Design a protein around this ligand. Structure first.
Ligand SMILES: CCCCCCCCCCCCCC(=O)O
Ligand SMILES: CCCCCCCCCCCCCC(=O)O
Ligand SMILES: [Co+2]
Ligand SMILES: [Co+2]
Ligand SMILES: [Co+2]
Ligand SMILES: [Co+2]
Lengths: 316, 315
């Protein structure tokens, strides 16, 4: 009767039971080819401990549900997420897609777009990685390389999988080249209702004119990297969030941290040194209190953190 | 007192016991990110049967040793190769390297070349994938995209790992853009003895003067894709191999098929339709009999299929 959302560990929830949700986080971000070939560079016990400690920190602030935006290309592992879910009791929602900024595998290029659609559709309708945990969203990615041929093919495939299954599309974009607008254009060509999409990493700018260009199209926007000052400082992100509420856009806003308890792209020392304030709790510690002090209401914070993630999954 | 070569399944051999060797083959060629995320697209039992069947086929012609050129990027799996080795009794030599034509992972780019060197050195000195099977060679790869910055880094890392460990370098190149010559240039910059290297896929051309430009540098050349007519037809490959022995180059020639019993880049029906003669035995069925017919001797075939693979590993 309702949408059914698989969560890690074998169960399903309805959108109404998501509760307070962090819509864009990670449990472990790692690179399949490196981990497959060089296991010596990794420590699964420490990775799991870090994920568990971060999710438990969020749970203390009343987070009920975390959407793990880790998909193929950045190391999605259902079985690892099952262990975090068992340990913390937080609902972990997973998805499908192919994360790349430039190229896709020969496997798919040599078979054509439908082979990639079909793999996503498999995950959504049957289950991820031989499990009964189905993908509840599809991801599309674009970054500072722009719309390469292969990047365009993967965005189109995500769009086509959404058309077949009706799961929402959660995206990653790069604000510096206006690549967010390419997602919009392709999604419209493919017939996607933009209200079932999130334009990711829009919080990495404070350019209101650019942000409202996206918002006027009807998509959700991801104010989704709070704590990554290297993309945009915290004070600018909070000022932007507050201004967009004051201009009437609350129903389109989604907040998160994009936190990676492990990320293999960089040594852990370098992450600590560069973005020491990045955690999975900074929204609760710093952002919400500042918004409340500037007149944002309790019920407006609930609309953003509860209603908006729920409606991404249900529609109107 | 001799070089020690690990082989799949825990043991070590010396170069003198390699015997008749196929120096560039594959047992399973698969894409890590795809197999990790989409296991439904694969069938390990079928992959294993195909690898066993091909290796057994070669074993019937007296092959004793196969060098698996599958490294990171094309799905190297020591445990898989252990199964094949146990079933067939053929010695399987493995290596290390990073197979790419364009990019390498952020993991390494963000840490610097020495991180990639160190990973290769780990495989050579400790072992691959948590096993006591050590990499006995290092691979460097360039193709139709030419010398990208990341390709350059991986070629240089291969060279630096060779300088530290003395294992041979076995390469992949692409003949249409003369990328083979970028390998040589970089290896010379890094101080590599080219006699300890193989310039791969040189058999994809019949341009004898180009092939000789590479030969005069002192490296081994890989006449290594017999049966891949899409790269060069069989008759042209065999004519080239005969001519190069007649000209005096035998000590630098290596023959193989590059055969992939499974390859996930293309559906199997497409492979069968396009290269229906590609197998791990075509050299024995078609190539050697034509060479013998044209005056190449029994001993010359042994020098190429036994002595040259051995000398790659001993100097
Ligand atoms: C030199 C900068 C080092 C620290 C940078 C932290 C990295 C932020 C990674 C952004 C999120 C990972 C990828 C993704 O989730 O799309
Ligand atoms: C248009 C269809 C072409 C199908 C032909 C099969 C091609 C296989 C060649 C790849 C060789 C493996 C990669 C490598 O070993 O470097
Ligand atoms: Co992202
Ligand atoms: Co993310
Ligand atoms: Co090759
Ligand atoms: Co090969």
């Amino acid at each position: 009767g309702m949408v059914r959302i698989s969560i890690a560990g074998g169960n399903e929830i309805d959108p109404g039971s998501m509760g307070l949700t962090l819509f864009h986080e990670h449990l472990r971000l790692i690179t399949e080819v490196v981990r497959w070939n060089w296991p010596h560079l990794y420590n699964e016990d420490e990775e799991l401990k870090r994920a568990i400690d971060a999710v438990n920190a969020a749970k203390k602030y009343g987070v009920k549900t975390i959407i793990d935006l880790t998909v193929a290309g950045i190391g999605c592992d259902v079985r690892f997420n099952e262990k975090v879910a068992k340990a913390t009791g937080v609902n972990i929602i997973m998805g499908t897609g192919f994360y790349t900024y430039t190229e896709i595998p020969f496997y798919f290029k040599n078979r054509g777009i439908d082979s990639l659609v079909d793999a996503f559709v498999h995950d959504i309708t049957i289950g991820i990685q031989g499990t009964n945990t189905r993908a509840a969203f599809v991801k599309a990615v674009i970054d500072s390389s722009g719309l390469t041929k292969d990047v365009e093919m993967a965005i189109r495939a995500a769009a086509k999988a959404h058309i077949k299954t009706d799961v929402p599309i959660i995206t990653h974009s790069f604000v510096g080249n206006k690549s967010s607008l390419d997602l919009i254009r392709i999604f419209k060509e493919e017939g996607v209702d933009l209200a079932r999409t999130v334009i990711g990493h829009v919080g990495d700018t404070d350019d209101i004119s650019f942000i409202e260009q996206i918002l006027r199209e009807g998509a959700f926007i991801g104010l989704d990297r709070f704590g990554l000052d290297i993309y945009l400082p915290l004070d600018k992100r909070v000022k932007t969030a507050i201004e967009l509420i004051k201009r009437g856009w609350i129903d389109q806003l989604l907040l998160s941290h994009d936190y990676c308890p492990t990320i293999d792209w960089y040594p852990p020392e370098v992450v600590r040194s560069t973005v020491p304030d990045w955690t999975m709790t900074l929204i609760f510690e710093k952002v919400i209190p500042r918004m409340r002090s500037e007149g944002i209401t309790e019920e407006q914070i609930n609309r953003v953190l509860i209603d908006n993630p729920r409606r991404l999954f249900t529609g109107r």
